[PDB]
Amino acid sequence: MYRVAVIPGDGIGPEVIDGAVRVLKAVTGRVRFEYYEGGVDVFQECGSPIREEDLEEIRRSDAVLFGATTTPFDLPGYRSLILTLRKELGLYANLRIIPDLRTGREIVIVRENSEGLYFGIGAVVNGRAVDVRLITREGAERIARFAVEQAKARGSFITFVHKANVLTGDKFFRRIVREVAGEEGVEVRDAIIDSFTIKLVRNPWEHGVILSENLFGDILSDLATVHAGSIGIVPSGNYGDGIALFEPVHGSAPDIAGKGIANPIGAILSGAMLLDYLGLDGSLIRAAVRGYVVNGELTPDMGGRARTEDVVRGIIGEIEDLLSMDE
Amino acid sequence: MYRVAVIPGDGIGPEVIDGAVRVLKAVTGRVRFEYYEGGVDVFQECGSPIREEDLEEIRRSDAVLFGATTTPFDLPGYRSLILTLRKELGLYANLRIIPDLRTGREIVIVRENSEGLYFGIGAVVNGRAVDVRLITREGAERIARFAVEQAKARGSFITFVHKANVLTGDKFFRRIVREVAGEEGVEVRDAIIDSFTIKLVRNPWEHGVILSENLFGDILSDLATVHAGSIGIVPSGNYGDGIALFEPVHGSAPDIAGKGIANPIGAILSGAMLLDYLGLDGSLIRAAVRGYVVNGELTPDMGGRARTEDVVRGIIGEIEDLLSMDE
Ligand SMILES: [Mn+2]
Ligand SMILES: [Mn+2]
């Protein structure tokens, strides 16, 4: 069996993960699920958002499925669970796919996930606060390679988004992205981070594989979300050399926690990207979701009246029906 | 007389500045205009995008009116004219006002303009590229004060946009913004840079005085632009303690240069913000623009068939008619 660590988190985390696990169970019986706590509770109790011993099982698992975690601003010494797991497990590539769920058109974003303004060199001293945006040859290269494989796989091009005009690290990063895309015969279109925000809302579907630095990607990927109607249908993968973690792009949504209305599609489609990572199909889940939305009542964030459970059952329904054409 | 340095720049720069100067001349005869070259030509010839001796007249003028400048990516040692003038003239506050020109609703952005990722400490060394995001007590304070005056003046609040969760400099900056807004009894709403991109496209009009770091503001202010239909209607002021510079938010647009179709409204309304800065009215220009757009054919970037000249004349028309109610 494939062993998959599951980390529901908190807020709506549990609800949408329950959704995504049940859908996985409905397409494959080849995966064992092991549940771990994580978040402020774990921190309050142990000093870390994840326990050391759990982190050691987690890192030896085949893949991780992650819900969402509340990172409270006013809790000293506390670091985000997802940011922590990203660095601990070596997850340098973040891939976010925003779908127009009717047409099947996609915005594809590759966010560098290990460095940039997330590298973590910051300090205050004598009324001077500083954060170091670090781009590194190995970091630029590996994420460039990752982005070219996504380009190749789609017969498409790379839109590298930057502020190389102002940021010496983006000048460096651009160079490297262009070399590897050269080595591999992939086209690289320039885009500048400020004007690209306009192109992204007005002409979403024409940019191929978007690649950018960590924080830039964080920003762009939330913006791209407007073209899917809700952030809560968007999935992601966080990939490293020996493992990967899958989570919906959305967050804790603590205000609607436990009310039965959260959108599970983000988690579910993240479950799909997980099956792909293991070499199971995922296509079935994607087809099932697409199949369901043609006439299914959706969640309130999408404008519908449906409960979380109606969507979950609805999609499982499509999956059971889909099973019988391995053919 | 008021002495105003005018820097047309290049690309569509000249065209829209010609527009904005003529409109100014039509509302006040109390301003002398002095023209200076700037951009790559000046660089190629002298090593600097602005000549030292001109920069010395410019800095002793009462205000600056600036068109737009082409900053070519592949020109070694060349720094942006506008970025250069921002630092040389001490222009730490950038104010961008995006208008819905029918309703009169506004998005108000205060971008810190002297530091952050624009401070200019960057380096590469042994495959390691770095840029230092610097926030400084004096920089945080002065821009916070500037933002509270814009809040007070509007009987409104401040939306401080950040990534304090990840960026130690934004934690520092937040603190300072909250203290001064406290001293002054102004409300400060938190917003996070990634999710705020969603709020900004979906609920543009409800955020009061948006304040952020330099690069964040650069990014947000281009995005806000989608709610005005074209970037080319949006004006800005760059303010420092002894002087200010006014420029449309848009850029060179070299591809449509010299074709007669550029939108001058951005420059014109920037001319308005200039009159306000001198203590002339500006209201007249704003009223004239609003007056003109109710039935005037607009430029191609707004979907119309009008030439640059039709809009310029049209607005002057409204101004001449407006003059006779000092009353
Ligand atoms: Mn984010
Ligand atoms: Mn910009």
XYZ file of C-alpha atoms and ligand atoms in Angstrom:
656
model
C 0.000 0.000 0.000
C 0.861 3.669 -0.362
C 1.162 5.383 3.005
C -0.340 8.847 3.185
C -0.034 11.160 6.161
C -3.131 13.218 6.604
C -3.105 16.493 8.504
C -6.611 17.955 8.751
C -5.476 21.025 10.646
C -8.229 23.169 12.126
C -11.040 25.507 11.181
C -12.750 24.116 8.096
C -9.645 21.904 7.647
C -11.277 18.739 9.057
C -14.501 19.216 7.086
C -12.912 19.467 3.664
C -10.367 16.732 4.404
C -13.097 14.360 5.472
C -14.519 15.166 2.066
C -11.280 14.601 0.170
C -10.395 11.344 1.958
C -13.785 9.737 1.336
C -13.463 10.583 -2.359
C -9.984 9.029 -2.425
C -11.318 5.921 -0.665
C -13.938 5.715 -3.374
C -11.326 5.548 -6.164
C -8.576 3.482 -4.618
C -8.310 1.011 -1.728
C -4.527 1.043 -2.257
C -3.770 3.853 0.265
C -3.413 3.748 4.045
C -4.271 6.986 5.854
C -2.610 8.019 9.088
C -3.842 11.074 10.955
C -1.652 13.607 12.768
C -2.540 16.715 14.767
C -0.933 20.010 13.895
C -1.401 23.711 14.605
C -1.558 25.977 17.662
C -2.772 23.210 20.027
C 0.309 21.165 19.207
C 2.422 24.330 19.650
C 0.876 25.294 22.977
C 1.563 21.801 24.220
C 5.045 21.037 22.740
C 6.617 24.284 21.467
C 6.202 23.259 17.800
C 3.196 23.278 15.411
C 4.068 19.665 14.598
C 5.594 17.179 17.084
C 9.107 15.999 16.262
C 8.112 12.348 16.358
C 5.166 12.870 14.034
C 7.289 14.902 11.686
C 9.537 11.785 11.494
C 6.685 9.509 10.443
C 5.348 12.185 8.147
C 8.668 12.495 6.336
C 8.858 8.729 5.707
C 5.325 8.554 4.289
C 4.719 8.464 0.567
C 2.738 11.710 0.442
C 0.930 14.174 2.680
C -2.640 15.446 2.541
C -3.039 18.698 4.378
C -6.197 20.628 5.186
C -5.725 24.159 6.493
C -4.284 25.800 9.564
C -5.026 28.996 11.438
C -1.849 31.055 11.858
C -2.755 33.678 14.481
C -0.855 36.943 14.060
C -0.518 37.625 17.789
C 1.040 34.376 19.032
C 4.729 34.878 19.830
C 7.296 32.438 18.429
C 4.629 30.650 16.383
C 5.384 29.728 12.817
C 2.744 28.593 10.279
C 2.305 24.826 10.115
C 2.309 24.771 6.300
C 5.379 27.043 6.072
C 7.119 24.782 8.605
C 6.279 21.563 6.723
C 7.357 23.165 3.428
C 10.855 23.760 4.775
C 11.161 20.567 6.865
C 10.129 18.259 4.008
C 12.165 20.023 1.268
C 9.120 21.114 -0.730
C 10.662 23.656 -3.125
C 8.005 23.650 -5.877
C 4.414 24.837 -5.345
C 1.993 24.176 -8.212
C -1.420 25.818 -8.260
C -3.973 25.139 -10.972
C -6.952 27.538 -11.149
C -9.759 26.015 -13.285
C -12.726 27.574 -15.087
C -14.749 24.562 -14.227
C -17.239 24.739 -17.079
C -14.867 25.311 -20.038
C -11.945 23.331 -18.574
C -9.498 26.215 -19.142
C -6.719 26.532 -16.598
C -4.341 29.043 -15.036
C -1.124 27.196 -14.136
C 1.166 28.775 -11.531
C 4.535 27.420 -10.403
C 5.541 29.276 -7.232
C 9.109 28.784 -5.966
C 8.500 27.492 -2.434
C 11.768 27.294 -0.433
C 13.432 30.738 -0.726
C 12.870 34.385 -1.836
C 11.287 36.472 0.907
C 10.431 33.173 2.733
C 14.106 32.180 3.304
C 13.793 33.741 6.757
C 16.691 36.098 7.233
C 15.078 39.033 8.969
C 16.073 41.308 11.828
C 15.326 44.596 13.556
C 18.109 46.762 14.985
C 18.122 50.446 15.938
C 14.842 51.286 14.239
C 15.885 49.417 11.101
C 13.968 46.355 9.963
C 15.213 44.195 7.194
C 14.187 41.043 5.264
C 16.473 39.432 2.797
C 15.035 38.250 -0.497
C 17.424 35.399 -1.402
C 17.541 33.724 -4.758
C 20.074 30.961 -5.117
C 21.479 29.166 -8.196
C 20.243 25.776 -7.056
C 16.797 27.242 -6.110
C 16.429 29.103 -9.376
C 17.534 25.978 -11.335
C 15.370 23.343 -9.750
C 12.201 25.448 -9.946
C 13.042 26.440 -13.529
C 13.420 22.742 -14.411
C 10.117 22.022 -12.678
C 8.409 24.749 -14.625
C 9.847 23.483 -17.999
C 8.496 19.974 -17.333
C 5.053 21.559 -16.810
C 5.504 23.485 -20.013
C 6.688 20.422 -22.027
C 3.927 18.283 -20.570
C 1.401 20.823 -21.872
C 3.147 21.805 -25.120
C 3.189 25.371 -23.830
C 5.514 28.168 -22.741
C 6.758 29.881 -19.573
C 5.684 33.353 -18.425
C 8.412 34.339 -15.919
C 7.013 37.131 -13.703
C 9.465 39.540 -11.999
C 10.748 43.019 -11.091
C 14.268 42.556 -12.493
C 14.310 46.312 -13.181
C 14.493 46.929 -9.400
C 15.460 43.592 -7.839
C 18.955 42.205 -8.426
C 17.785 38.755 -7.329
C 15.168 38.746 -10.092
C 17.771 39.710 -12.666
C 19.765 36.630 -11.503
C 16.660 34.452 -11.446
C 15.605 35.506 -14.940
C 19.019 34.550 -16.360
C 18.803 31.125 -14.900
C 15.201 30.536 -16.004
C 16.191 31.522 -19.577
C 19.240 29.237 -19.720
C 17.386 26.103 -18.612
C 14.424 26.886 -20.863
C 17.026 27.249 -23.616
C 18.715 23.921 -22.798
C 15.216 22.422 -23.092
C 13.823 24.397 -26.032
C 10.975 26.019 -24.066
C 9.810 29.555 -24.745
C 10.049 32.132 -21.903
C 7.817 35.236 -22.038
C 8.739 38.123 -19.703
C 6.092 39.665 -17.480
C 6.484 42.346 -14.832
C 4.755 41.769 -11.565
C 2.749 45.044 -11.439
C 1.437 45.149 -15.035
C 0.926 41.362 -15.012
C -1.721 41.796 -12.316
C -3.749 43.637 -15.029
C -3.071 40.997 -17.694
C -4.044 38.301 -15.208
C -7.500 39.661 -14.456
C -8.203 40.770 -18.100
C -6.616 37.968 -20.137
C -6.342 35.075 -17.651
C -6.078 32.146 -20.006
C -3.207 33.090 -22.269
C -0.041 32.913 -20.135
C 1.046 29.258 -20.220
C 3.150 28.199 -17.255
C 3.440 31.169 -14.897
C 6.588 30.980 -12.795
C 7.668 33.444 -10.129
C 9.442 33.964 -6.853
C 7.822 32.728 -3.591
C 6.002 35.814 -2.391
C 5.160 36.953 -5.916
C 3.646 33.541 -6.557
C 1.779 33.706 -3.279
C 0.255 36.973 -4.457
C -0.450 35.984 -8.058
C -2.046 32.629 -7.107
C -4.611 34.249 -4.805
C -5.431 36.806 -7.533
C -5.880 34.111 -10.219
C -8.571 32.740 -7.967
C -11.105 35.359 -9.068
C -11.420 33.427 -12.356
C -12.624 30.286 -10.567
C -15.359 32.109 -8.676
C -14.123 30.962 -5.289
C -10.684 30.371 -3.872
C -12.212 27.201 -2.390
C -12.188 25.197 -5.637
C -8.447 25.631 -6.185
C -5.974 22.759 -5.448
C -2.215 22.697 -5.034
C 0.777 20.383 -4.775
C 3.947 21.093 -2.831
C 6.677 18.936 -4.337
C 10.188 18.032 -3.190
C 12.681 15.354 -4.253
C 11.519 12.524 -1.968
C 7.919 13.489 -1.078
C 4.995 15.866 -1.685
C 2.171 17.513 0.205
C -1.249 18.428 -1.124
C -3.586 21.082 0.207
C -6.327 23.266 -1.071
C -5.163 26.854 -1.686
C -7.865 28.172 0.660
C -7.323 28.671 4.396
C -8.870 27.931 7.775
C -11.988 30.027 7.228
C -12.561 29.937 11.001
C -15.726 32.068 10.780
C -17.631 29.303 8.876
C -16.006 26.396 10.680
C -18.406 23.649 11.759
C -21.409 25.072 9.867
C -21.479 22.477 7.095
C -20.995 24.914 4.198
C -17.281 24.819 3.274
C -16.363 24.037 -0.312
C -14.495 20.656 -0.442
C -13.597 20.914 -4.091
C -10.224 22.458 -3.368
C -9.287 19.550 -1.098
C -10.820 16.989 -3.423
C -8.912 18.187 -6.483
C -5.842 18.254 -4.277
C -6.568 14.621 -3.550
C -6.490 14.265 -7.363
C -3.053 15.797 -7.649
C -1.999 13.404 -4.895
C -3.185 10.334 -6.833
C -1.241 11.614 -9.848
C 1.852 11.911 -7.623
C 1.564 8.331 -6.463
C 0.923 7.134 -10.054
C -2.732 6.351 -9.485
C -4.999 8.257 -11.851
C -6.572 11.455 -10.378
C -8.239 11.972 -13.783
C -11.187 10.085 -12.344
C -11.636 12.689 -9.562
C -11.195 15.580 -12.007
C -13.766 13.990 -14.341
C -16.075 13.354 -11.394
C -15.836 16.987 -10.237
C -16.350 18.355 -13.741
C -19.170 15.839 -14.167
C -20.816 16.928 -10.922
C -20.680 20.700 -11.505
C -22.575 20.603 -14.827
C -25.770 20.239 -12.781
C -24.871 20.001 -9.100
C -25.930 22.629 -6.582
C -22.717 24.211 -5.264
C -21.622 25.794 -1.963
C -22.502 29.377 -0.789
C -19.091 30.773 -1.722
C -19.971 29.811 -5.291
C -23.513 31.271 -4.859
C -25.413 27.978 -4.389
C -27.410 26.655 -1.424
C -25.715 23.213 -1.148
C -24.177 21.886 2.070
C -20.597 20.478 2.157
C -22.105 16.960 2.315
C -24.251 17.302 -0.837
C -21.158 18.107 -2.887
C -19.124 15.282 -1.375
C -21.790 12.650 -1.963
C -22.498 14.098 -5.387
C -18.885 13.666 -6.475
C -18.567 10.162 -5.014
C -21.701 9.377 -7.018
C -19.955 10.420 -10.230
C -16.897 8.427 -9.273
C -18.753 5.151 -8.687
C -20.376 5.611 -12.107
C -16.999 6.450 -13.703
C -15.226 3.396 -12.362
C -16.550 0.973 -14.999
C -14.533 2.323 -18.023
C -10.946 1.327 -17.460
C -11.709 -0.070 -20.964
C 4.576 82.946 -10.449
C 4.850 79.286 -9.521
C 7.741 77.596 -11.295
C 7.025 74.115 -12.581
C 9.615 71.824 -14.113
C 8.132 69.732 -16.840
C 9.707 66.469 -17.942
C 7.813 64.965 -20.883
C 10.048 61.921 -21.097
C 9.601 59.752 -24.173
C 7.185 57.374 -25.836
C 3.675 58.725 -25.356
C 5.155 60.972 -22.619
C 5.262 64.126 -24.790
C 1.755 63.597 -26.178
C -0.021 63.344 -22.849
C 2.067 66.115 -21.278
C 1.250 68.460 -24.115
C -2.317 67.615 -23.199
C -1.891 68.209 -19.474
C 0.030 71.487 -19.862
C -2.525 73.049 -22.206
C -5.274 72.184 -19.722
C -3.253 73.780 -16.912
C -2.687 76.882 -19.055
C -6.429 77.040 -19.520
C -7.090 77.221 -15.758
C -4.227 79.331 -14.502
C -1.788 81.823 -16.043
C 0.064 81.834 -12.702
C 2.569 79.048 -13.597
C 5.802 79.181 -15.586
C 6.771 75.944 -17.338
C 10.366 74.951 -17.950
C 11.155 71.893 -20.039
C 13.951 69.399 -19.363
C 15.053 66.292 -21.256
C 15.363 63.012 -19.428
C 15.694 59.310 -20.206
C 18.070 57.061 -22.156
C 19.195 59.828 -24.565
C 20.368 61.905 -21.623
C 22.031 58.769 -20.182
C 23.771 57.807 -23.411
C 25.135 61.316 -23.631
C 26.036 62.113 -19.964
C 26.005 58.878 -17.923
C 22.812 59.875 -16.055
C 19.097 59.804 -17.021
C 18.927 63.422 -15.856
C 21.800 65.942 -16.147
C 23.241 67.161 -12.854
C 22.674 70.799 -13.729
C 19.053 70.227 -14.682
C 18.479 68.208 -11.561
C 19.638 71.350 -9.669
C 17.056 73.584 -11.330
C 14.451 70.879 -11.000
C 15.004 70.598 -7.257
C 14.569 74.362 -6.750
C 11.309 74.485 -8.721
C 7.971 74.544 -6.968
C 6.720 71.274 -8.455
C 7.451 68.801 -11.231
C 5.209 67.485 -13.991
C 6.477 64.240 -15.395
C 5.247 62.276 -18.393
C 6.619 58.759 -18.779
C 9.959 57.154 -19.465
C 11.050 53.961 -21.165
C 13.320 51.944 -18.866
C 14.904 49.326 -21.151
C 15.750 46.083 -19.361
C 18.940 45.427 -21.330
C 20.830 48.703 -20.851
C 23.692 48.252 -18.381
C 24.086 50.715 -15.503
C 20.826 52.456 -16.414
C 18.419 53.366 -13.672
C 14.790 54.453 -14.262
C 14.349 58.213 -14.538
C 11.302 58.245 -12.241
C 12.994 56.009 -9.637
C 16.036 58.306 -9.783
C 13.988 61.503 -9.343
C 12.024 59.895 -6.490
C 15.210 59.351 -4.502
C 17.025 62.561 -5.534
C 14.093 64.838 -4.654
C 13.150 63.083 -1.369
C 9.736 61.942 -2.594
C 8.781 59.404 0.094
C 4.985 59.361 -0.374
C 3.265 58.133 -3.556
C -0.489 58.746 -3.770
C -2.560 57.062 -6.458
C -6.270 57.693 -6.871
C -8.172 55.257 -9.129
C -11.585 56.732 -10.097
C -14.790 55.125 -11.374
C -15.357 58.118 -13.527
C -19.130 57.892 -13.800
C -20.061 57.331 -10.122
C -17.159 59.356 -8.680
C -16.105 56.499 -6.365
C -12.399 56.232 -5.673
C -9.690 53.760 -4.696
C -7.059 55.652 -2.679
C -3.582 54.118 -2.406
C -0.671 55.521 -0.402
C 2.490 53.697 -1.493
C 5.640 54.241 0.594
C 8.080 55.547 -2.025
C 11.641 55.797 -0.619
C 12.451 52.372 0.908
C 11.271 48.712 1.149
C 12.536 46.622 -1.753
C 13.440 49.922 -3.555
C 16.093 50.963 -0.969
C 18.683 49.420 -3.285
C 20.835 47.101 -1.242
C 21.288 44.158 -3.556
C 24.199 41.913 -4.466
C 25.170 38.626 -6.082
C 28.012 36.504 -4.705
C 28.827 32.826 -5.244
C 25.507 31.936 -6.838
C 23.605 33.798 -4.129
C 21.505 36.829 -4.995
C 20.015 38.987 -2.349
C 17.817 42.114 -2.027
C 17.201 43.738 1.272
C 13.690 44.882 2.097
C 14.368 47.756 4.532
C 11.736 49.412 6.634
C 12.938 52.204 8.857
C 11.302 53.997 11.820
C 11.427 57.378 10.125
C 10.129 55.876 6.813
C 7.322 53.990 8.495
C 6.382 57.116 10.535
C 6.315 59.735 7.837
C 4.279 57.590 5.436
C 1.933 56.586 8.269
C 1.411 60.283 9.079
C 0.801 60.973 5.394
C -1.748 58.213 5.216
C -3.595 59.476 8.387
C -3.918 62.973 6.885
C -5.551 61.348 3.830
C -7.815 59.408 6.128
C -8.750 62.474 8.266
C -9.272 64.586 5.171
C -11.800 62.008 3.951
C -13.333 61.027 7.306
C -12.233 57.470 6.585
C -9.931 54.709 7.806
C -6.631 53.031 6.904
C -6.317 49.553 5.377
C -2.662 48.616 6.056
C -1.698 45.821 3.623
C 1.167 43.452 4.572
C 2.706 39.996 5.072
C 3.697 40.493 8.725
C 3.219 36.734 9.195
C 6.357 36.142 7.071
C 8.145 39.500 6.885
C 9.760 40.926 10.022
C 9.891 44.369 8.406
C 6.110 44.329 7.976
C 5.631 43.380 11.610
C 7.721 46.493 12.485
C 5.872 48.632 9.957
C 2.459 47.544 11.221
C 3.366 48.533 14.797
C 4.360 51.964 13.725
C 1.306 52.502 11.508
C -0.942 51.506 14.453
C 0.749 53.828 16.961
C 0.481 56.945 14.794
C -3.089 56.112 13.786
C -3.720 55.764 17.523
C -2.092 59.118 18.360
C -4.449 60.571 15.733
C -7.611 58.561 16.399
C -7.732 56.916 12.951
C -8.932 53.362 12.451
C -6.486 50.807 10.948
C -7.897 47.674 9.265
C -5.442 44.813 8.616
C -5.239 43.252 5.174
C -2.854 40.593 3.910
C -1.291 41.168 0.562
C -2.356 37.870 -1.097
C -6.016 37.727 0.018
C -6.352 41.507 -0.427
C -5.784 41.057 -4.161
C -9.148 39.174 -4.139
C -10.903 41.807 -2.011
C -9.535 44.505 -4.300
C -10.995 43.107 -7.504
C -14.315 41.967 -5.867
C -15.023 44.777 -3.392
C -12.908 47.688 -4.686
C -14.667 50.605 -3.077
C -14.737 49.683 0.584
C -11.131 49.912 1.829
C -10.590 53.580 2.726
C -6.969 54.683 2.617
C -4.874 51.731 1.449
C -1.305 51.971 2.699
C 1.505 49.537 1.974
C 5.195 49.060 1.424
C 6.813 50.295 -1.839
C 6.716 47.195 -3.996
C 3.407 46.023 -2.542
C 1.942 49.413 -3.386
C 3.441 49.245 -6.848
C 1.624 45.952 -7.338
C -1.690 46.911 -5.742
C -1.931 50.252 -7.609
C -1.614 48.614 -11.033
C -4.255 46.030 -10.032
C -6.704 48.703 -8.792
C -6.540 50.055 -12.305
C -8.911 47.398 -13.652
C -11.751 49.306 -11.937
C -11.084 52.442 -13.995
C -11.195 50.598 -17.306
C -7.760 51.780 -18.361
C -4.568 52.423 -16.470
C -4.341 55.583 -18.602
C -6.946 57.567 -16.642
C -5.129 57.175 -13.321
C -3.088 60.083 -11.806
C -0.498 60.193 -9.052
C 1.479 62.545 -6.832
C 4.947 61.887 -5.463
C 5.358 64.067 -2.390
C 8.375 65.022 -0.280
C 8.992 67.723 2.335
C 10.083 70.553 0.015
C 8.642 69.549 -3.392
C 6.428 67.133 -5.348
C 6.261 65.463 -8.730
C 3.154 64.497 -10.658
C 2.845 61.823 -13.309
C 0.202 59.598 -14.717
C 0.455 56.021 -13.396
C 0.721 54.684 -16.957
C 4.039 54.214 -18.767
C 5.798 54.957 -22.040
C 3.513 52.819 -24.189
C 6.181 52.925 -26.916
C 4.128 50.754 -29.299
C 1.427 53.483 -29.693
C 3.810 56.421 -29.498
C 3.195 59.145 -32.081
C -0.105 57.673 -33.333
C -2.394 60.251 -31.738
C -4.387 57.801 -29.594
C -2.893 57.937 -26.072
C -5.216 58.709 -23.187
C -4.238 62.111 -21.638
C -6.610 61.842 -18.724
C -3.985 60.344 -16.454
C -1.644 63.277 -17.088
C -4.455 65.805 -16.931
C -5.739 64.611 -13.559
C -2.129 64.595 -12.432
C -2.029 68.223 -13.472
C -5.033 68.557 -11.119
C -3.177 67.066 -8.191
C -0.372 69.488 -9.021
C -2.672 72.532 -8.821
C -3.895 71.257 -5.447
C -0.254 71.013 -4.312
C 0.455 74.595 -5.262
C -2.814 75.763 -3.622
C -4.567 76.504 -6.889
C -7.797 74.556 -7.265
C -7.526 71.347 -9.389
C -11.242 70.789 -8.669
C -11.889 72.649 -11.902
C -9.904 70.056 -13.917
C -11.557 67.156 -12.077
C -14.987 68.700 -12.737
C -14.029 69.325 -16.358
C -12.915 65.703 -16.841
C -16.007 64.307 -15.136
C -18.074 66.786 -17.149
C -16.457 65.697 -20.408
C -16.796 61.923 -19.925
C -20.591 61.976 -19.443
C -20.880 62.313 -23.228
C -17.402 62.585 -24.725
C -15.994 59.960 -27.069
C -12.990 58.425 -25.285
C -9.676 56.877 -26.385
C -9.223 53.290 -27.773
C -7.900 51.931 -24.477
C -11.292 52.860 -23.041
C -13.059 51.359 -26.120
C -13.866 54.631 -27.941
C -12.714 55.948 -31.328
C -11.517 59.412 -30.161
C -8.037 60.778 -30.875
C -5.833 62.230 -28.077
C -6.657 65.730 -29.398
C -10.461 65.342 -29.215
C -10.229 64.563 -25.505
C -7.833 67.422 -24.807
C -9.939 70.017 -26.600
C -13.082 68.539 -25.098
C -11.784 69.009 -21.560
C -10.469 72.525 -22.206
C -13.964 73.260 -23.509
C -15.467 72.219 -20.176
C -12.889 74.255 -18.321
C -13.577 77.511 -20.177
C -17.280 77.011 -19.413
C -16.514 76.203 -15.750
C -14.414 79.287 -15.159
C -17.346 81.677 -14.646
C -18.533 80.333 -11.207
C -15.939 81.377 -8.686
C -19.214 82.743 -7.198
Mn -1.233 32.857 0.243
Mn 4.433 50.078 -11.379
